[PDB]
Amino acid sequence: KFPRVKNWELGSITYDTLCAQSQQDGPCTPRRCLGSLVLPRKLQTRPSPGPPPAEQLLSQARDFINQYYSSIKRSGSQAHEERLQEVEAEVASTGTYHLRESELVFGAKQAWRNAPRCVGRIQWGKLQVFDARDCSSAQEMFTYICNHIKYATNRGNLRSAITVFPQRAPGRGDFRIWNSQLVRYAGYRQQDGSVRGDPANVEITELCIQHGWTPGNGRFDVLPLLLQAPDEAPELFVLPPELVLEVPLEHPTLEWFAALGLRWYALPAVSNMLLEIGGLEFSAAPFSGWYMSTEIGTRNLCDPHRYNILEDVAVCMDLDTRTTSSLWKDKAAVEINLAVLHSFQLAKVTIVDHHAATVSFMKHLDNEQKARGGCPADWAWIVPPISGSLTPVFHQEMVNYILSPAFRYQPDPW
Amino acid sequence: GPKFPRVKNWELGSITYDTLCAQSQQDGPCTPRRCLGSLVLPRKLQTRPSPGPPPAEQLLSQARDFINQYYSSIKRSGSQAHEERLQEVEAEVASTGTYHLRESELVFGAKQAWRNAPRCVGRIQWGKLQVFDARDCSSAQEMFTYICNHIKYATNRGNLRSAITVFPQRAPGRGDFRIWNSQLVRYAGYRQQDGSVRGDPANVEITELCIQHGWTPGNGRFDVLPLLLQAPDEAPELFVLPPELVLEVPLEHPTLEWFAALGLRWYALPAVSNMLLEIGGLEFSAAPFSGWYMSTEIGTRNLCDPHRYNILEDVAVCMDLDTRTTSSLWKDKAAVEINLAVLHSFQLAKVTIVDHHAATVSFMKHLDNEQKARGGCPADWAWIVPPISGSLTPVFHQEMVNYILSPAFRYQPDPW
Ligand code: HEM
Ligand code: HEM
Ligand SMILES: O=[N+]([O-])c1cccc2c(Br)n[nH]c12
Ligand SMILES: O=[N+]([O-])c1cccc2c(Br)n[nH]c12
Ligand SMILES: O=[N+]([O-])c1cccc2c(Br)n[nH]c12
Ligand SMILES: O=[N+]([O-])c1cccc2c(Br)n[nH]c12
Ligand SMILES: [Zn+2]
């Protein structure tokens, strides 16, 4: 049952015993592996048609409290058995329960620590948790968010942070942030099917316009937020320009690069995922850290269904775009990633390259093997989009499983 | 909707369902509890030498599945020729404990094994494979004659042709036909006194086995190894490939003049020879197959892997790059130029080669051809996406379902 895990660069071997703690099922079976699938339908977080079984919830709850008390080394103590009873009496009576701030802080950190697709988990212990459970309006969500952004950005010296809004309650709508990230660029479906801006944001941009936003016409127009309080229509909120930090891209040696007019924001804040802690679900819990240069230079700027600048850059570099064997694509992508690192470093904004990032992840995997006897990792996401085998994680076998607390995907609110 | 794995292509936003996986009769390493898809050698396709024949009934079920597959491919499923063949296989297994394949059946199974290989990006060529029947072979000496013939035909002076040579199957109460080498062409790995390794670090053991068996070792970085061929119940015999049969390509860069001075080179023919070909339950322990190289395999893996030649730093220093800081992306720049050299050099020498962009584009075409043909295609994402410029190829944006279908090429324990 326990996986023999091997690193092919070093020849070392380890056994993942942490996978035995996984209580949630993934999409794979012995007949076929679906590890490469981006999204689920089974691992998804289905709405509350009513309160989920008290036994099931109480089981996840007790396990979390147990995890919390081990965390502070006061396991088995009186403080522990009293807390387990509080949780049980509360579920038995109301069908749900509530967490203490310190449990929520522990839970939030464990959620990040448990995320298999995150290559930045070495930073898991340093996370600023903002308790925004004292929120009752879209207006209040906005204030909290602005404060999250101000703190997280920190003049360019980024700090990891998460804001937790009210949990889901049975028989009531969810608190939701309609945007996938707090900061994203608009995607305008310009007449001929083409899209000015980020093609991945066509739908959300249309929804913003539908809710009163007067749109722009640039390639990098920061989008407004659609915040939604329970059973209420989403409200539109324009983020103050002084709050959104952006880095204009330029190349260290290629003078003409800057003329491309490219730029990217400093803060990567995912705001569409569900945070699950002890059976409870927080539908609104935006989190942020800092960028790995490849997400910007490779994925966001070079993906075919995204900005797709690969060719424009290759033409400017005067590369042989006629044939694939000239490797014009590979050369252009490397220069774009270098431009991102140069630009962010020049602007004094936090950034980390894929080589440094994966090296740190290897250290993290080692820390975790010692600490918990394994570490859930999703190979396809941990290995960077360019230069895969050039990094240490490529040659490292990994085991992927679901551990709780956990960040999960959830249905779009519309 | 449909009760099958839903697969999405994120670049195009298109959806497909894999119904072919339903026909998988063999389990992989994953369970709903955890995914072990990233593991290289899972104990699944692994075939530990069964002392005797397969259970008459287990072999029988596998045999029946293959015969059905065969008749279905020639469009005679349910016919008298089909039912007669099924009876003939059962009768043969009932009296002898095993059975034998008709020539066309062997050709079909061999092509299907390639078609079914999850990790092969070059499967769009599956239909055009030359199958050499070597089931008459009876000595290590003859295995060598057959291999040299394969190498000659397959190499074809630089205009490579896919081919597989099938030696006699595993037999009850009779040793196996084995090729000790991992590939027909491999460079030697010499363990230095100082601990280092000259040549290919990956080939240290086979090199030492060659020496233990009479090989007089050289001491270069690119010394082609001799073959250790093994016939039934005999010790392996050493056979040196005549130099003129092993085509090699001196590597040079199209603009960086100094690259040629590095003295780097690579052989033109990739021929895997340590895998077991399984068809209808019959095992062909010796069945070397070859095709042609995808540039990344040479320039990125073979030449740049830290546990292989590891030439990244040397090329970086030559390009005068900052190898003291990761942010200079010195590794990336060098690897790109190393891959361009492999492509430029093979094209210059008139030897078949395919860049990772052209290969993945063609695999996308293969995926479409197989959706319509079989209703899905077993693919191992981690092995299909190139070791460099991953998201720049169309396969990165294509979800994939991985499973084991038979006939198949499986891993098997080293003979020693
Ligand atoms: C410290 C800096 C960080 C870096 C450099 C980093 C980098 C990455 C990268 C490259 C990915 C893979 C691509 C993707 O899924 O979009 C990822 C995924 C992820 N990270 Fe991190 N991360 C960081 C901080 C954080 C923080 C603060 C959290 C949560 C508290 C977090 C949670 C996750 C999760 C849940 C995913 C998966 C998202 C999905 O499934 O789409 N990360 N991270
Ligand atoms: C025609 C050109 C071909 C190309 C460009 C090609 C390319 C590749 C590549 C890149 C791999 C991935 C690396 C690896 O797994 O070792 C691979 C794997 C494989 N190919 Fe192909 N291939 C070709 C021909 C063939 C042929 C002719 C056969 C068999 C008849 C074959 C059988 C396989 C198998 C079984 C593997 C898996 C090896 C493993 O388990 O590691 N391939 N191929
Ligand atoms: O840097 N990244 O590539 C990246 C991807 C996805 C999420 C995050 C967060 Br939250 N910080 N950085 C991230
Ligand atoms: O070493 N690994 O752990 C590993 C995982 C997944 C794919 C590959 C390839 Br292709 N080489 N090594 C790999
Ligand atoms: O080109 N390749 O990278 C490659 C890898 C593994 C096996 C083969 C064969 Br057989 N032809 N090409 C191959
Ligand atoms: O699109 N995909 O099929 C797919 C599979 C596995 C990983 C990724 C990433 Br990271 N982006 N797209 C992916
Ligand atoms: Zn799997």
Side-chain angles (χ1 to χ4, degrees), chain A residues 8 20 22 26 28-33 36 38 298 305 324 330 353-355 385 387-389 395 397-398 400-401, chain B residues 10 21 27-28 30 32-35 38 40 300 305 307 326-327 332 355-357 387 389-391 399-400 402-403:
Chain A
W8 294 86
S22 181
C28 297
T29 60
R31 176 194 254 37
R32 79 291 180 276
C33 164
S36 71
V38 175
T298 306
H305 49 307
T324 56
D330 309 70
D353 63 72
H354 54 297
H355 295 295
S387 305
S389 65
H395 314 289
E397 285 175 354
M398 295 165 199
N400 194 14
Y401 44 96
Chain B
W10 295 86
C21 57
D27 303 329
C30 305
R33 168 178 227 62
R34 77 289 181 285
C35 179
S38 73
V40 178
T300 305
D305 262 14
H307 51 310
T326 55
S327 59
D332 315 71
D355 69 81
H356 56 288
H357 294 310
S389 299
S391 67
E399 296 181 346
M400 300 168 195
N402 189 192
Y403 42 100

Side-chain angles (χ1 to χ4, degrees), chain A residues 1 3-4 8-9 19-26 28-39 41 298-299 302-305 310 324-327 329-331 333-335 337-338 341 345 353-356 379-380 385-390 394-395 397-402, chain B residues 4-6 10-11 21-22 24 26-41 43 300-301 304-307 312 326-329 331-333 335-337 339-340 343 347 355-358 381-382 387-392 396-404:
Chain A
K1 45 202 247 73
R4 188 193 118 274
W8 294 86
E9 171 188 349
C19 62
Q21 306 306 337
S22 181
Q23 294 302 312
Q24 189 69 319
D25 289 354
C28 297
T29 60
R31 176 194 254 37
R32 79 291 180 276
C33 164
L34 293 171
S36 71
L37 277 58
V38 175
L39 302 172
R41 298 95 47 81
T298 306
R299 301 308 305 280
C302 299
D303 265 16
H305 49 307
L310 222 35
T324 56
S325 56
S326 70
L327 304 190
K329 290 187 174 180
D330 309 70
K331 292 178 168 191
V334 169
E335 297 307 311
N337 282 81
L338 188 72
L341 286 163
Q345 293 176 339
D353 63 72
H354 54 297
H355 295 295
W379 197 97
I386 54 170
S387 305
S389 65
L390 272 43
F394 182 106
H395 314 289
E397 285 175 354
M398 295 165 199
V399 190
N400 194 14
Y401 44 96
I402 304 169
Chain B
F4 305 98
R6 193 169 182 261
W10 295 86
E11 166 177 359
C21 57
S24 173
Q26 180 161 343
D27 303 329
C30 305
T31 58
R33 168 178 227 62
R34 77 289 181 285
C35 179
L36 293 182
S38 73
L39 277 55
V40 178
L41 300 175
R43 294 293 182 278
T300 305
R301 302 309 302 288
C304 301
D305 262 14
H307 51 310
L312 224 37
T326 55
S327 59
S328 64
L329 299 191
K331 293 193 180 193
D332 315 71
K333 292 187 176 181
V336 171
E337 304 302 340
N339 275 259
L340 183 64
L343 282 160
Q347 296 175 154
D355 69 81
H356 56 288
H357 294 310
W381 197 95
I388 53 168
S389 299
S391 67
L392 305 183
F396 184 101
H397 313 287
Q398 172 68 57
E399 296 181 346
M400 300 168 195
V401 189
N402 189 192
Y403 42 100
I404 305 174

Side-chain angles (χ1 to χ4, degrees), chain B residues 207-264:
Chain B
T207 293
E208 292 178 358
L209 280 171
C210 281
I211 301 170
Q212 288 174 214
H213 284 92
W215 185 50
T216 298
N219 52 193
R221 282 196 98 184
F222 302 103
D223 293 346
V224 181
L225 288 165
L227 300 176
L228 266 175
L229 308 177
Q230 186 183 42
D233 304 287
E234 299 177 29
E237 288 168 41
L238 211 66
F239 297 93
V240 176
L241 294 169
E244 73 270 18
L245 296 193
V246 182
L247 177 58
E248 291 177 90
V249 185
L251 304 181
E252 65 167 60
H253 203 276
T255 59
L256 302 183
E257 305 184 352
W258 54 265
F259 200 97
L262 255 28
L264 299 170

